[PDB]
Design a binder for these strands. Structure first.
Ligand SMILES: *[C@@H]1O[C@H](CO)[C@@H](O[C@@H]2O[C@H](CO)[C@@H](O)[C@H](O)[C@H]2NC(C)=O)[C@H](O)[C@H]1NC(C)=O
Ligand SMILES: *[C@@H]1O[C@H](CO)[C@@H](O[C@@H]2O[C@H](CO)[C@@H](O)[C@H](O)[C@H]2NC(C)=O)[C@H](O)[C@H]1NC(C)=O
Ligand SMILES: *[C@@H]1O[C@H](CO)[C@@H](O[C@@H]2O[C@H](CO)[C@@H](O)[C@H](O)[C@H]2NC(C)=O)[C@H](O)[C@H]1NC(C)=O
Ligand SMILES: Nc1nc2c(ncn2[C@@H]2O[C@H](CO)[C@@H](O)[C@H]2O)c(=O)[nH]1
Ligand SMILES: Nc1nc2c(ncn2[C@@H]2O[C@H](CO)[C@@H](O)[C@H]2O)c(=O)[nH]1
Ligand SMILES: *[C@@H]1O[C@H](CO)[C@@H](O)[C@H](O)[C@H]1NC(C)=O
Ligand SMILES: *[C@@H]1O[C@H](CO)[C@@H](O)[C@H](O)[C@H]1NC(C)=O
Ligand SMILES: *[C@@H]1O[C@H](CO)[C@@H](O)[C@H](O)[C@H]1NC(C)=O
Ligand SMILES: *[C@@H]1O[C@H](CO)[C@@H](O)[C@H](O)[C@H]1NC(C)=O
Ligand SMILES: *[C@@H]1O[C@H](CO)[C@@H](O)[C@H](O)[C@H]1NC(C)=O
Ligand SMILES: *[C@@H]1O[C@H](CO)[C@@H](O)[C@H](O)[C@H]1NC(C)=O
Ligand SMILES: *[C@@H]1O[C@H](CO)[C@@H](O)[C@H](O)[C@H]1NC(C)=O
Ligand SMILES: *[C@@H]1O[C@H](CO)[C@@H](O)[C@H](O)[C@H]1NC(C)=O
Ligand SMILES: *[C@@H]1O[C@H](CO)[C@@H](O)[C@H](O)[C@H]1NC(C)=O
Ligand SMILES: [Ca+2]
Lengths: 776, 776
RNA sequence: UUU
RNA sequence: UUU
């Protein structure tokens, strides 16, 4: 950070630099500002003020800031229902005239979420991007668009919908956008639009008309858009069954009415989204002149019958992605899957998703139309309530990256809300997985209670198997997964593993990662034999996760591995296994010879009995003891951890630091003490601690730091030093620290905002960075 | 509390009165004391000082306190391993001489957990009870027992064991206790005792010799104890398999050796505990002269074979309780249960526990020896890894109160640690269920994935069924429980209920309480139809618990009941169902016409949209909105809840109270605002709020309270007012409050200890009750 | 802070 | 705090 020494440390904003674009970026996101801060550098190019309470903008706002290419002034007055009900914006944002017209270089302007009533005027002709989402602008008129000749990108959505209502239909003047001769992207989503606006500039590449009241498309509506690549008409005549938002369908179960010739102009179309349009038929004719369609979304329609027919697919040999999820006929539970022969035409297909078709049995041959699709990578059949499926059918799908049968009822990545989101592409005010192991079979959240070898016959190619969230209550003995000779990752979390036998999992001879987290069930009942020593047999295991198992007893006293590097053991009861006076489990982790990372956070350890560190394995580097309620800690015992580099002690009740950190651990690089009860440092704390790089003392109760505790020869090595949310006393005794804080180049986050005096007197609440201690 | 106005409010101890015994009880438990407090009333009879740091006792300690009948001075210096590792006691408690000899009326003295080295001398002859547990007294000599002639009760345990070791065998002089001619109870547990001390006073009623190194009983050892009622020899030659403490068995798997005539003197014996004695045989001869034995514990032995034989039981026709739990042969999994014919002799038997026998199949006829035990109430067969059991066999057990099959592997109240506790009867430093509905079948924590009517065929008598913690993933439709016509309580928690059908549970026509908590599984996946309106059909349902289900969607918009009085709905996502601008679920609870208690805590409600309170059902009395992260609350809306009496708003972020509580809710009796961010009250807050009785403002950030906020005509009605852990400013502006706090008789808990100034100056940390504001 |  |  030598380039940053020119800028003031008092600025409550994060400053960064894109060298080679000569951009100075300044980020004042969510800093509780009522004024643009004075201090913003003259050379600032990208300025972000989103999530603040600046009530107006004037020519004074940006007078000095002549180099601005981008202003992000979003969410300073968000509509009532979109916003905080504690911090309700009293009055819309006021933009006085001539506020932007002076910015010759302004390429991007964001004014979303400010309750604006009309399109801001006075905008410079250099402007390429204008964003006005989540305002109250519901009438577009040619008169208002006169200064936007150079505009390429226009975002006008979310100005009239259930969360920001305008109480009328959206109005666009005939030809409103036609004279914007460089317009590439236009978004009119979530707006109560009733007809496609015409005529649109032929230069458009992307048009978003989704979530509106458009009941019909005219054959003329997209006539001239011969450069269009993305069209989204989704959510016009929506499918409302289980919608998690208020939802009015078109009268009489009617689909969005699209004439057969309506897409004929669209020769460049790559992407077509017709999600939630209540479609019953997909006429093949639609696609006659679209030869390069790559992505097609037909989810949330009523296309169950069509999936069995689907003549349209013969016209899509370059399609990469096809989504037909959630097309089930209400109240019907089909016996089986009827996939059309036509799916065999989809020669370029990489991703097929057919969630929510809703059927009882998947027979091997019902996916045969896909067997010869050479490029198919993902087949998603989740959320189908499938009860029966012979998994061996996926031998015909070795070439796939992912076979997803998540959320079904089988017995012997996309975001969680996705197909049922109102607008999954919506912008927040804040901003603008084992697949890498190879072939993956995802059986998570099914009803598998018992597994046996024969279940995985013909699946020896699998690299990752996800059995998370089944019902498996079995004493695994090393015979259940015998065919999975190539398996590298197994997720067995959220089952009810019964570790009676130490031969469990031994047959997975290439296993690298095993997750048996959240199998607490048998660990919670007394008198049950549990063998934690099963690790010995897994000869290439690197990572073992056994979190949230409530482990408080083990019949074996040692875990052993020649290979394991990482062990997550959080949310167990090491406090019970290491009860004071009981030596038996002090060497629990000692024979994990290659162990470098150990997480024993959330284990309810008020104290560590002696023996614990001596019993750690010799290569331990990363140790977490976070969130244990620790109240004391013999720092001297760190001498036993000769390779320790990171010690996470956050979120405990430690009241002291070691007298001499260098006499405790020569190797220690990162020490994390945040959220403890430390009231003072020790006199020579960091002395001679040359190896230290990172030190978090944030969220403690520290009053004073003196120079002897914090020698410069150490501090100037620190990559980072965190000191915020402490109880700093700002008397003349604190003068070294106050001065040092003001002048050091050591990185201290939240320095301007949250390193604050608690006293005395009128110093309360005042940043230490701004403090003038002229009498000391 | 008029009797209590005589005692000082500054006393950091709870004072109470047993009228009619003329006892004044004073409790200073855990108040961080280094001195006995001055202020303890002269008439104090029972004084408790446990869990403090008083380093010595002298004649000054109790000079004034001449009426003391009981001193509880435990745990002022607990042994290192038993105690806090943060607050380690530096030095044993010092008892200077003549400290007790002046107390003519002292009947009970507790000095446990003070690292004492010898038995305290100078004790008054009125003493009936002396307790010295958890000290370092490991040699008993007749010389030391000279002042104890009147002693009835002596507790000497926990002076030499794995958590407080003495490093030698315990020593008792021959005849040590013989001359204590009134000794009734003697406890030598947890002491490294190697032989039964002889000869013991014949007046003994209870003798606790458990958890020791006693390998043999001599035929003479209990010769003269013809009044003995309780004998505990447990844990001498322990069974160590899966012991959760360090455990050395007697050499060569050897049992505790008890001669066949060893109990012949014990004609009064009611209770015999032989838990964890590695017994292989129970010779019938032991019980020849014990005709009134009521309770017998033979758990944690090696009696699996003996349970199939068991001739000793013919000699126990008055036995009420028999425990044979955890007798399995290591490494053996029996095909079935072999119960001896002899169990049919147990004519008085009420409770039989046979956990941990460990067998695969329970056939109907294998319990036939119990069929004609007329008084049998509890049959406990938990933790047996039973895989098969025809539940209809319990038609032969209609008369039982509880049939417990908890923790087995069946596919189509004791504390948690109990049989594996080191000492389940141990004293803490601090102190010294659906069964009521009728017949209960507990199938919790089994492997039941599917249920059907025929499973419950001859079980129509059941009143309570616990299916908690099975694997049930089924769409219940009202046919699965048809035979359970008399069922009143069903616990279906920790399954995976799939509420597709609104007919679920309708067949349980007499159902009063239904628990479907922790069935979150299908609620977490989008697009799944869920019918919360199933409540309509259950015509006598009183209480419905549906906690921690993560509910964020429902196909139905209303829950309906003519009968339901309590609904627990905590740990769901009402925030999503009541998203601002979505009206559809604002009447979710409206048609629960008789609903009086609603818990919607932990539902992630930053705010309540309007409509919520209007949509509450008309008889709502008890509402919890705790732990929601609420940041604002329109108090005026409480007008809609015309019968509200309790409002729990604890653990939120509210920053204000209503301007006028009486203009918000005339009916409100208990208002709970603890753990919020309230900084000041409103000027007339409680004015005219005559109906208020309970008000918790603890753990806020309150600086000042003025008289206008807190009128006396309201306050003097308050049963309780909580004000602790606030941020009180102690200036002259606070004078009304400081004075009022000092003189009111309103109950304010923690007044002496935790109502404290934060400022200004040297007032910091000082109790407001002690504050002298003489200049105001 | 005798479990 | 546009989900
Ligand atoms: C600073 O603002 C400029 C102008 O809005 C951003 O420029 C974009 O940069 C990306 C890649 O970095 C290009 O693909 C876009 O074409 C540019 N947009 C325009 C309108 O010119 C720049 O990225 C911003 N930088 C930061 C770090 O926020
Ligand atoms: C979308 O526009 C419609 C009409 O095109 C709005 O509906 C009108 O709203 C007012 C106030 O609720 C009613 O008095 C009228 O009856 C409605 N008219 C019709 C024809 O429905 C609607 O509010 C707009 N939607 C949003 C979300 O703003
Ligand atoms: C109970 O007494 C035994 C012996 O009676 C103690 O064992 C001795 O302990 C010390 C230190 O562990 C050894 O050096 C001795 O050699 C042991 N002697 C024998 C005879 O075993 C034991 O420590 C005592 N137990 C407790 C818990 O205090
Ligand atoms: N944990 C477990 N133990 C079993 C089972 N079946 C028999 N056992 C035996 O039960 C005892 C306690 O777990 C041990 O002796 C086991 O060998 C089972 O399914 N799970
Ligand atoms: N919740 C649930 N829905 C099912 C099941 N089988 C079919 N469905 C159908 O799937 C859709 C979503 O639940 C509804 O139309 C249901 O009728 C099942 O086992 N559970
Ligand atoms: C599925 O297709 C088969 C023939 O391949 C046919 O018998 C059946 O009617 C189809 N099912 C439905 C529900 O349309
Ligand atoms: C499942 O299919 C495979 C052929 O891929 C066959 O080996 C196996 O026997 C089938 N099992 C069942 C239960 O249908
Ligand atoms: C297994 O499935 C669950 C989704 O049901 C998911 O949370 C988990 O991440 C998956 N595992 C892996 C390794 O991706
Ligand atoms: C209270 O103590 C006094 C002084 O020792 C005694 O005279 C008086 O009788 C006691 N009161 C009662 C009710 O015992
Ligand atoms: C259980 O008793 C039967 C006879 O009723 C006997 O044949 C069987 O072997 C017994 N089992 C064992 C393990 O002793
Ligand atoms: C269980 O026993 C009952 C007799 O009480 C009988 O009705 C039934 O056939 C048995 N059920 C099974 C599944 O064996
Ligand atoms: C059901 O059993 C579990 C023990 O697994 C217990 O938590 C629960 O309290 C029992 N339910 C009732 C109503 O007693
Ligand atoms: C469940 O469905 C209906 C109840 O409405 C019933 O007639 C049917 O027989 C039931 N079937 C099963 C298999 O539970
Ligand atoms: C539950 O709601 C659904 C539709 O929302 C309706 O079909 C059904 O009749 C309702 N059932 C009851 C018992 O109220
Ligand atoms: Ca200055």
């Amino acid at each position: 950070s030598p380039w940053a020494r020119w800028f003031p440390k008092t600025l409550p904003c994060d400053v960064t630099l894109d060298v080679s674009k000569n951009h100075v970026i300044v980020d004042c996101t969510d800093k509780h500002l009522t004024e643009i801060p004075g201090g913003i550098p003259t050379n600032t190019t990208n300025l972000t003020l989103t999530i603040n309470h600046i009530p107006d903008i004037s020519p004074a706002s940006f007078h000095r800031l002549v180099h601005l290419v981008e202003i992000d002034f979003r969410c300073n007055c968000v509509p009532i229902r979109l916003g905080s009900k504690s911090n309700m914006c009293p009055r819309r944002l006021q933009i006085k005239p001539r506020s932007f017209s002076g910015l010759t270089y302004l390429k991007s302007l964001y004014l979303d979420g400010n309750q604006l009533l009309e399109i801001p005027q006075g905008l410079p002709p250099s402007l390429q991007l204008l964003s006005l989402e989540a305002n109250n602008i519901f009438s577009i008129r040619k008169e208002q668009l006169t200064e936007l000749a150079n505009i390429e990108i226009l975002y006008l959505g979310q100005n009239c919908y259930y969360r920001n209502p305008c109480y009328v239909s959206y109005s666009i003047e005939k030809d409103a956008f036609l004279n914007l001769t460089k317009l590439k992207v236009l978004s009119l989503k979530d707006n109560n639009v009733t007809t496609v606006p015409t005529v649109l500039p032929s230069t458009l590449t992307e048009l978003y008309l989704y979530n509106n009241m458009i009941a019909e498309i005219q054959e003329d509506d997209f006539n001239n858009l011969n450069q269009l690549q993305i069209l989204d008409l989704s959510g016009n005549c929506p499918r409302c069954y289980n919608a998690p938002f208020p939802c009015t369908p078109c009268k009489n179960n009617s689909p969005l009415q699209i004439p057969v010739n309506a897409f004929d102009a669209l020769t460049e179309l790559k992407v077509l989204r017709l999600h939630s349009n209540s479609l019953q038929h997909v006429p093949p004719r639609w696609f006659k002149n679209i030869n390069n369609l790559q992505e097609l979304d037909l989810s949330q329609n009523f296309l169950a019958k069509e999936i069995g027919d689907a003549k349209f697919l013969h016209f899509l040999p370059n399609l990469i992605q096809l989504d037909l999820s959630f097309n089930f006929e209400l109240q019907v539970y089909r016996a089986s899957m009827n996939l059309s022969q036509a799916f065999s035409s989809l020669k370029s297909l990489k991703i097929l998703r057919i969630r929510g078709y809703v059927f009882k049995e998947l027979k091997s041959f019902q996916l045969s139309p896909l067997h010869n699709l050479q490029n198919l990578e993902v087949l998603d059949l989740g959320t189908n309530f499938i009860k029966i499926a012979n998994l061996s059918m996926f031998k015909q799908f070795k070439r796939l990256k992912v076979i997803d049968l998540s959320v079904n009822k089988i017995s012997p990545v996309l975001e969680q809300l996705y197909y049922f989101r109102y607008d999954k592409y919506a912008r927040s005010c804040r901003f603008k997985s084992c697949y890498k192991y190879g072939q993956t079979l995802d059986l998570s959240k099914n009803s598998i209670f018992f597994i046996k070898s024969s279940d995985f016959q013909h699946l020896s190619f699998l690299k990752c198997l996800n059995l998370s969230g089944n019902l498996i209550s079995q004493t695994l003995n090393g015979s259940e997964f015998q065919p999975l000779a190539e398996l590298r990752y197994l997720d067995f979390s959220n089952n009810r593993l019964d570790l009676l036998h130490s031969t469990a999992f031994e047959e997975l001879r290439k296993l690298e990662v095993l997750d048996i987290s959240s199998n607490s069930h048998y660990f919670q009942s007394e008198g049950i034999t549990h063998m934690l020593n099963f690790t010995k047999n897994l000869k290439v295991l690197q990572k073992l996760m056994m979190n949230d198992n409530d482990i408080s007893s083990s019949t074996s006293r040692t875990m052993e591995s020649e290979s394991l590097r990482t062990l997550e053991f959080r949310g167990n009861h090491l406090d019970v296994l290491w009860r004071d006076g009981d030596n038996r489990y002090l060497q629990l982790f000692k024979n994990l010879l290659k162990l470098e990372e150990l997480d024993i956070s959330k284990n309810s350890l008020s104290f560590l009995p002696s023996g614990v560190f001596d019993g750690m394995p010799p290569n331990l580097k990363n140790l977490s003891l976070a969130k244990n309620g620790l109240k004391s800690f013999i720092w001297e015992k760190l001498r036993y951890l000769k390779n320790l580099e990171t010690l996470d002690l956050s979120h405990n009740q430690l009241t002291t630091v070691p007298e001499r950190l260098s006499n405790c651990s020569r190797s220690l690089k990162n020490l994390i003490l945040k959220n403890n009860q430390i009231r003072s440092l020790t006199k020579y704390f960091l002395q001679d601690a040359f190896q230290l790089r990172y030190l978090d003392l944030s969220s403690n109760k520290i009053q004073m730091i003196q120079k002897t505790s914090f020698p410069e020869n150490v501090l100037n090595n620190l990559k980072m030093l965190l000191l915020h949310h402490n109880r700093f006393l700002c008397t003349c005794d604190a003068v070294w620290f106050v001065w040092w804080v003001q002048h050091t180049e050591v990185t201290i986050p939240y320095l301007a905002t949250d390193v604050t005096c608690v006293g005395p007197g009128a110093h309360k609440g005042q940043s230490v960075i701004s403090l003038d201690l002229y009498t000391c």
